[PDB]
From TrEMBL, chains A, C:
The chain holds residues 97 to 425 of 432 of the full protein. This is Enoyl-ACP reductase. It comes from the Eukaryota. One of its GO terms (molecular function) is nucleotide binding. NADH binds at G10, Y15, W35, D72, A73, L120, K189, L219, S221, A223. NAD(+) 2 binds at I9, Y15, D72, A73, S74, A121, K189, L219, S221, A223. NAD(+) 1 binds at residues 8, 10, 15, 35, 72-74, 120-122, 169, 189, 219, 221-223. One of its GO terms (biological process) is fatty acid biosynthetic process. It comes from Plasmodium falciparum (malaria parasite P. falciparum). The gene is FabI. Pathway: Lipid metabolism; fatty acid biosynthesis. Keywords: Fatty acid biosynthesis, Fatty acid metabolism, Lipid biosynthesis, Lipid metabolism, Nucleotide-binding, Oxidoreductase, Signal. Belongs to the short-chain dehydrogenases/reductases (SDR) family. FabI subfamily.
Amino acid sequence: EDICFIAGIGDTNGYGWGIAKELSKRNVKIIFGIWPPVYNIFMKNYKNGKFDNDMIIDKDKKMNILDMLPFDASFDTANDIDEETKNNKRYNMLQNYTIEDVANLIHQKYGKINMLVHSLANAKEVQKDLLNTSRKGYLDALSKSSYSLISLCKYFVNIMKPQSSIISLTYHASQKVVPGYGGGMSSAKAALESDTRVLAYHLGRNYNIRINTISAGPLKSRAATAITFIDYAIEYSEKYAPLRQKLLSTDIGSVASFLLSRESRAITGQTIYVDNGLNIMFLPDD
Amino acid sequence: EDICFIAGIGDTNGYGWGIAKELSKRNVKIIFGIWPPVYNIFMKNYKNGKFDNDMIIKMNILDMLPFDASFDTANDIDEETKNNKRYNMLQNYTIEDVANLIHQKYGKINMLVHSLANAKEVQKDLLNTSRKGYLDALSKSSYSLISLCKYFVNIMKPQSSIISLTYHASQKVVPGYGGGMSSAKAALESDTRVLAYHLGRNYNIRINTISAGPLKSRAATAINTFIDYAIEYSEKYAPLRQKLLSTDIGSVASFLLSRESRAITGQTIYVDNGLNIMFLPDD
Amino acid sequence: EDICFIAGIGDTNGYGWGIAKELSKRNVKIIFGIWPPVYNIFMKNYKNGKFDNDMIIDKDKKMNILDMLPFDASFDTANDIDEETKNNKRYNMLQNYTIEDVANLIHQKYGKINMLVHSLANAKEVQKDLLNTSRKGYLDALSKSSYSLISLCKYFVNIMKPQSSIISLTYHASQKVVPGYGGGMSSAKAALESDTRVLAYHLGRNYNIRINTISAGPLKSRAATAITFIDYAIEYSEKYAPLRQKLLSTDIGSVASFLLSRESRAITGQTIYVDNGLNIMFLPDD
Amino acid sequence: EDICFIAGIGDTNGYGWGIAKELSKRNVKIIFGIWPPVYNIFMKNYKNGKFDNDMIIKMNILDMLPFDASFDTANDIDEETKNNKRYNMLQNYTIEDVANLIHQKYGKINMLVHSLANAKEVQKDLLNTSRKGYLDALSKSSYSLISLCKYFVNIMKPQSSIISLTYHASQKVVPGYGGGMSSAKAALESDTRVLAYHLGRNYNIRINTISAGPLKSRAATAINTFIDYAIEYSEKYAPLRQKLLSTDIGSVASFLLSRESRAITGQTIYVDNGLNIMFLPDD
Ligand SMILES: NC(=O)c1ccc[n+]([C@@H]2O[C@H](COP(=O)([O-])OP(=O)(O)OC[C@H]3O[C@@H](n4cnc5c(N)ncnc54)[C@H](O)[C@@H]3O)[C@@H](O)[C@H]2O)c1
Ligand SMILES: NC(=O)c1ccc[n+]([C@@H]2O[C@H](COP(=O)([O-])OP(=O)(O)OC[C@H]3O[C@@H](n4cnc5c(N)ncnc54)[C@H](O)[C@@H]3O)[C@@H](O)[C@H]2O)c1
Ligand SMILES: NC(=O)c1ccc[n+]([C@@H]2O[C@H](COP(=O)([O-])OP(=O)(O)OC[C@H]3O[C@@H](n4cnc5c(N)ncnc54)[C@H](O)[C@@H]3O)[C@@H](O)[C@H]2O)c1
Ligand SMILES: NC(=O)c1ccc[n+]([C@@H]2O[C@H](COP(=O)([O-])OP(=O)(O)OC[C@H]3O[C@@H](n4cnc5c(N)ncnc54)[C@H](O)[C@@H]3O)[C@@H](O)[C@H]2O)c1
Ligand SMILES: Oc1cc(CCc2ccccc2)ccc1Oc1ccc(Cl)cc1Cl
Ligand SMILES: Oc1cc(CCc2ccccc2)ccc1Oc1ccc(Cl)cc1Cl
Ligand SMILES: Oc1cc(CCc2ccccc2)ccc1Oc1ccc(Cl)cc1Cl
Ligand SMILES: Oc1cc(CCc2ccccc2)ccc1Oc1ccc(Cl)cc1Cl
C-alpha cells in the first residue's frame, strides 16, 4: 500500500497527470494537490466526466484517485495567509490549503505516505527577460518554484515512512541559456537542482529518504502555452533530439515511477534528463 | 521476449552478476560473454553448482559464450593469442563472431550490457603511464564499447537499449585509479553521448552509462585494497549509508534497458548512494 | 583611464580588497560600494590610517581610491527604502545608497565606467541548514546574493562603455554539497552562476558587455568568520588541494583583473575556479 | 626570463601562432616544435620572409625545432619513419630528445603549450571508426600531452605552467567531429585534472586546457568545410558577435601561463565568445 502526494495538477495536459497515470500502473494511491484558483474548475471537470478517458490505464484499470485537495505552494503555514488572498473569491470557499495544513490533513485522513511529487512552478514576470525582471518578480519565481520544494520536504518528512522518495521537475535552462525562459525561472530551476543535492544529503542522513529531479523536455502543458515558445521548442526537439519520437507526459511518468520506487534505492541528489537526449547536443546537425 | 547479452562476467562478485540477477527477475533471457582467461573455471563452477546460492532470487541463463572484446573480427586475432593455452580450443569469440553466433542461434536481441574494463598499467599513476599502457586502457575499456555497438546494432531491434558501467574518476580526481583508466572512463562517458546521437537517429536505439559506486569485485581487489578504503569512505560519507549492492546497480540497469526509460539517452546516471554530490567530508 | 566600481568591501580582509589592489597595479581607478551599517566605521578606520600598509602596491604606488560610497544591495531604487531602515541610526546620516542612486551618483561625478565588481553576499539564516531555512530567510539570501547582481547590471549598464566587463564571486557549494553553508547560500550561488550565463547572453548581444563569475576557494574574511567552518575549510584546502600554497585575496584579485580587461574579450558567461585546484578532487588522498 | 615551448605550429593560420604572438607581446622567448611533414616549408617561408607581416605586433623566435609528439623516445621511432624522406635528415625530434636538447641549449624553461591533434579517421563518425583509427586519435591528441608533461617536467622550474587546447565536442555532440577526436578531447580534459593533481603536489606546476571556438586553421579546413559553417554559426549565435581571433585564445594562454593565474589548475577554460553557454538557437 503505497501513497503518493502529487502537488501541481490543474488539468490532464501536464507532467503531474502523466506521473499519476504511471504510478497507477504500480497500484500506487494518488492524492492531488491543486492550486486553489483552479481547484473548483478542476473538480467540476472531474465530476462532469471530462477526464474519464484520460483516467484509463489498462483494459482492467481506472486511475485510483484517493483524494484531491486545494494546495498553495506560496504559503508554509496558516500564519502566512495574507488578507487580500484570504478574501479572493476563489480562496474564500477553501480551507487548509497551506503546505503544513495539507500535510496535517493527509496524515489525519490517510496516515503516513511514501512518495512525494513536486510538479509545479510559477513566476509572475516569466514573460520578461532576466535583465528586466524586478526583485519582486524574481523572488516570486524563487518562492513558488524553488523554496516550495524545501518547504514541502520540511512539512512532509514528518508524515513519510523511512526509505520514502521525492522527485521534482526541472528544465535545462538552469544550465544552458534559453532566451524566452524569463522572469527568474531559469534561476529558480538552477536553485532547485542545487537544492536537490543539499536536500539529498540532509534527508539521506537524517531520514533515509531520497530526492531527485527530472529535467524534462518540452510538453504542451497549460503553463508552457501561457508563457508560443512551446510550439517552437517542441518542433526543435522533434527535429534535433537523438530520439525522434514525440515526448509524452507518460515518458516522464515512467521515469518518475522508477525514481519513486525502491528499484532506485542507490540514486539520490541527481538531475535525471528525460528529454529524448536533446540535452547532449551542441550545434544543430544541419 | 527480452534477450540480453552481458559482456563482462567472470564470477558472481561483480556488477555483471548483479545485473544478470535483476534482469532475470523481470524474466529477461541472459546470454553471458565470458573472457577466455576465466571461461573454463566459470563454466566448471556453474556446472559443479557453486553458483546455486548466488542464483537465488532462480536465474534463466540461456547461454554462456567465450568472448574477448579486444578483437573486433577473427582477422584481428594475433597468432600468439590464437595459439594460446586458453584460446586454442575456443572459437567465435571476437566481437563480430559472437554477434553472428547469437543472431544465428536466437535471432535479434533487444538489450546489451558492456560490463568490462582492463588496463595493463592500472597501478601506475597517469603521469608515469606508458603510451602502450594508456592505449591498452582505451582499447579495452572504451573502444570495446564502440565496436560492441557497431556489430550488435545489426542484430538488435528498433527500441533496443545499451548500457555500460563507468566511474566518477573520469570527472573528479581519484589518485590510485591509474594507467589511463580515468582517461578511458572520460572517453566512454563522452562516446556514450556521440553513440546516443548516431544510434538514436539511425536505429532508434538508446545508450546510457551507469556511474557505479565502489564494490569489492575481483577487478577492484586486484588493484594495489584502495577498494576497502573506497567502500568504507562511501559508507561513512555518502548521503545514503546502506551498503551498496551489486543488485542496486542491477535494478537501475534493468530500468535503463527496459522501455520504461525510452526517453533517456546519452546519459551518465550515478548509482552510488549519492556520494558524487559531496564536496567536503562533513566532519 | 579605466574606472571600476567594487560593491562589497567592509574592511581589508575580503576578496573585494584583493581585487582593488590588483586592479590598482593596472592603474585602474577604484570606487568602493560599502554596506551602510559598516560605512562610517570603514571611513573612520580609513581616516585613522588603519589601511595604509594594506594600500601599498609597489615601491612607487599607493592604491588610488577614487571614492567610497554607501551602497545597499537590498534596495533597487529610492522607492524601495522601508521606514524602519530609513530610521535606523546607521542609515539616517546617509543618502543615495540604493543601487540606482549609486549608479546615478557615479555617473554624475565621474562619467561612464568600464568595470564592475559584485563582491557581496548575505543570508539572514546562514547558520541553519537548508531544510530548516524559512521562506523569508531563503528569499533574503536570494535577494541579497543573487538578485543584487541582476539589479546591479540593469542600473549600471546605462553608465558603462561598450566592451565593458563584469565579475561576481561565487562558491562551489552551488555545485557540490558543503554541509554548513546554510540559509539558502548554496541556492543563491547556484542561481548566481546560472544568471551569469543568461546575463552574458543579453549583455553580450545588446551591449557587447561581458560577465563572468569567479568561484573562489576559502579566505578568512569577516563574512566567513561570522558564519569556524572557515578555519576548517582553509586547513582542508591547504592539505588536499593540488596546489599547497596559501590562497590569497590577491590570487582572486589577479584573476579578476584579467577577466575585467580586454585580454579576456572572448570569455563570457563562465564560472572560473580560483581555488588552488581543490574543485577537481573527488576523495581525500590519504 | 620566461621561456615557452610551443608544440604544434605549422604555419601562421592556427592557434599556435596566435599564442606565440601574444606571449611575444609579454617578452617571453618562444621555441617552436614543428612536425617534420611541414618542418622544411615553415623554415623556408620564415627565412624567405613570408611571415614578416604575420609577426607584426616584432616577435622573438628563439628556436625552431623539428618535433614529433608520436614518439616518446628515440627507441620508439620505427625504422620506416626513421628512414622516411621527411625524417631521414632530422635528429632529436622525439619528446625526450627535444626536452634534452632545449635544456642543454637554454637551461630550464617555465612555460609549455600543447597545441596539436591528429586522427587518421577524423572523417568517419565515431560508430564507424576502427580500433586502429580511435587509438591513433588518443595517441596523438591525448597521450602526447601526458608524455610531454612527463619529460618537460624535469626541465621546468617550480611555479611553471602548461596549457593545451580542446574543443566542446568532448562534452556536447558535434556530428562531423569524427574518428575518436571527441573521445580524445574528453580524455584530454579529464587528464588535465589528474595531471594537475600530480604536477601540483610534486612539482608545484600548473596545467589547464583552453576550449577554443572555431578558427579556420589548416587542420580545420582539411576536415570534410564544416569549419565555415561552425564559424558562421558561432558569429550568428554566440553571446559575443565579434570574429574569434587566434590572438583571443593567445591572450588567455598568456594569462594562464603567467603567474597571474597561480591559483588556477586542472581547469577547462572556454574561449569561444560564450557559445558553449547556449542551449537553443534564439530564433
Ligand atoms: N511543459 C514543459 O515543457 C516542461 C519542461 C520541463 C519542466 N517542466 C516543469 O514541470 C512542472 C509541471 O509543469 P507542467 O509543464 O506540467 O505545467 P502545468 O500547467 O500542468 O502544471 C503546473 C502546475 O503548477 C501549479 N501552480 C502554480 N502556482 C502554484 C502555487 N502557488 N501553488 C501550488 N500550485 C501552483 C498550476 O496550477 C499548475 O497545475 C513544472 O515544475 C515545470 O517547470 C515543464
Ligand atoms: N567494482 C567497482 O567498484 C566499480 C565501480 C565503478 C565502475 N565499475 C565498472 O564496472 C565494470 C565491471 O567491473 P567489476 O568491478 O564488476 O569487475 P569484474 O572483475 O567483476 O568484471 C570485469 C569483467 O571484465 C572481463 N573482461 C576484462 N577484459 C575483457 C575482455 N577483453 N573481453 C571480455 N571480457 C573482459 C573480466 O573477465 C571480468 O569479468 C567495469 O566497466 C568497471 O570499470 C566497477
Ligand atoms: N571568503 C571566502 O572564503 C569566499 C569563498 C568563495 C566566495 N566568496 C564570496 O566572495 C564575496 C565577498 O565576500 P568575502 O568573503 O570577501 O567577505 P567580506 O565580509 O569581505 O565581504 C562581504 C561584503 O558584503 C557586504 N554586504 C552584506 N550585505 C550587503 C548588502 N545588503 N548590500 C551591500 N553590501 C552588503 C558586507 O558589508 C561585506 O563587506 C561574497 O560573494 C562571498 O560569497 C567568499
Ligand atoms: N581550429 C579550431 O577551430 C580549433 C578549435 C578548438 C580546438 N582546436 C585545437 O587547437 C589545437 C591546434 O589546432 P589548429 O586548429 O590551430 O590547427 P593547426 O593545423 O594550426 O595546428 C595543429 C598542429 O599540430 C601539428 N601536429 C600534428 N601532429 C603532430 C605531431 N605528432 N607532433 C608534432 N606536431 C604535430 C601540425 O603540424 C599542426 O601545426 C588542437 O589541439 C586542436 O584540436 C582547434
Ligand atoms: O519549466 C517549464 C519549461 C518548459 C520548456 C519549454 C519552454 C517554454 C517556454 C519558454 C522556453 C522553453 C515549459 C514549461 C515549463 O513550465 C513552466 C514555465 C514557466 C512557468 Cl511561470 C510555469 C511553468 Cl509550470
Ligand atoms: O572501474 C572500476 C572502479 C572501481 C572503484 C574505485 C577504485 C577501486 C580501487 C582503486 C582505485 C579506485 C573499482 C573497480 C573498477 O573496475 C576496474 C578498474 C580497473 C581495471 Cl584495470 C579493471 C576494472 Cl573492471
Ligand atoms: O560565500 C562564502 C563562501 C565561503 C567558503 C568557506 C566556508 C565558510 C563557511 C561554511 C562553509 C564554507 C566563505 C565565505 C563566503 O562568504 C559569505 C558566506 C555567507 C554569507 Cl551570509 C556571506 C558571505 Cl560574504
Ligand atoms: O579540434 C579542432 C576543432 C575544430 C572546430 C570544430 C570542427 C571543425 C570542423 C569539423 C567539425 C568540427 C577545428 C579544428 C580542430 O583541430 C583538429 C581537429 C581534428 C584533427 Cl584530426 C586535428 C586538429 Cl588540429
